[PDB]
Structure formats: C-alpha cells, structure tokens
Amino acid sequence: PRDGKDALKLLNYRTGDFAMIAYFVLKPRCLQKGSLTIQQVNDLLDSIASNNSAKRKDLIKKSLLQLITQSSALEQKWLIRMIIKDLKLGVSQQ
DNA sequence: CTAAAAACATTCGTTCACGTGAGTTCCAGTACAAGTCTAGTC
C-alpha cells in the first residue's frame, strides 16, 4: 500500500542503510530458501544493465521481479547492496 | 698490691641501598577500515 508503513519506510529512508530497511520489509514476505545460483544472478544483473543501456525498463522490471520472487530476504539485501555498489564487509579490498 | 674504671674487641639484629628474576597489567605504538576530494548550470 502506498500509504502503508512499509511503503513510507522504503521511501523515507533519510536520503541503518536502505538494505536493512528492505530486509526488514521483505522478511515476512520472502521465502526461507532461494533457488538462484551465482551464474543466474550475474546473468540477471547483466540483462538489467544492458536493458538500461538500451532504454527498455520493462525488461529491467521483469528481471527485478524475478530476482525478488526467487530469493530470500538476506539474498534481497545482499543483491541491493551489490547493485548500489556498497557492501562494507569490514575487510578492505586490499 | 689490689680492685675497679676505662677502653677495646666480638657477635648479633635491624635498617637501608642496590641489583636482579618473575608475574601482572597498563598504555604508546602500530595496523587496518572507512570517508573525503569544488561548485554550479543546463
């Protein structure tokens, strides 16, 4: 719901990162065990990037829906962090 | 001559100063992670 607590929380994230809010929102909704391998995730991300380059948001929406429906809340949060390009695992790239 | 008063010699206990090995812990130093890097228009 656009006026539901989850919608405002996702939108009002003080532009405690967005990944944590998304994980909390998706916890009661998402499954407990995903079925996507690393190769499938990489293929979906590549498709999203290519469609963005080609200016076709329908395919981007379809790929995002597939990722959302075939992953768990932890997987959703990690995918969001990867897309944003901000992980902060506590260990530097070096 | 005589004993006695003074001086001298010895051993012990206590105090102190220094040196040194061992255990505990506190902290300066080091390593590492994360953020910043100019401001605006169109």
Side-chain angles (χ1 to χ4, degrees):
Chain A
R2 204 70 30 90
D3 55 55
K5 265 161 78 165
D6 308 325
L8 297 317
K9 272 171 55 46
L10 278 161
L11 289 161
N12 294 305
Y13 74 107
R14 314 308 307 277
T15 321
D17 58 344
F18 170 73
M20 270 280 107
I21 297 152
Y23 167 74
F24 284 160
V25 165
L26 294 149
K27 174 72 171 33
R29 277 117 174 155
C30 276
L31 317 96
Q32 232 58 58
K33 140 77 74 200
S35 310
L36 279 171
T37 68
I38 296 170
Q39 179 161 7
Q40 301 189 48
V41 166
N42 275 310
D43 297 352
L44 293 157
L45 293 164
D46 159 69
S47 308
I48 284 159
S50 90
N51 284 288
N52 170 71
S53 87
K55 269 140 154 26
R56 284 221 42 191
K57 305 288 155 269
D58 177 24
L59 283 299
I60 287 159
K61 210 176 295 314
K62 168 164 189 162
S63 305
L64 261 161
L65 183 49
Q66 166 61 304
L67 278 171
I68 290 157
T69 57
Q70 274 182 11
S71 269
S72 151
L74 212 64
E75 283 155 82
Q76 308 300 347
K77 145 165 78 89
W78 285 120
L79 269 158
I80 293 155
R81 278 171 167 156
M82 288 163 196
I83 285 158
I84 286 173
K85 300 171 183 310
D86 164 44
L87 252 69
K88 298 292 116 175
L89 292 164
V91 299
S92 182
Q93 175 201 317
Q94 228 156 41

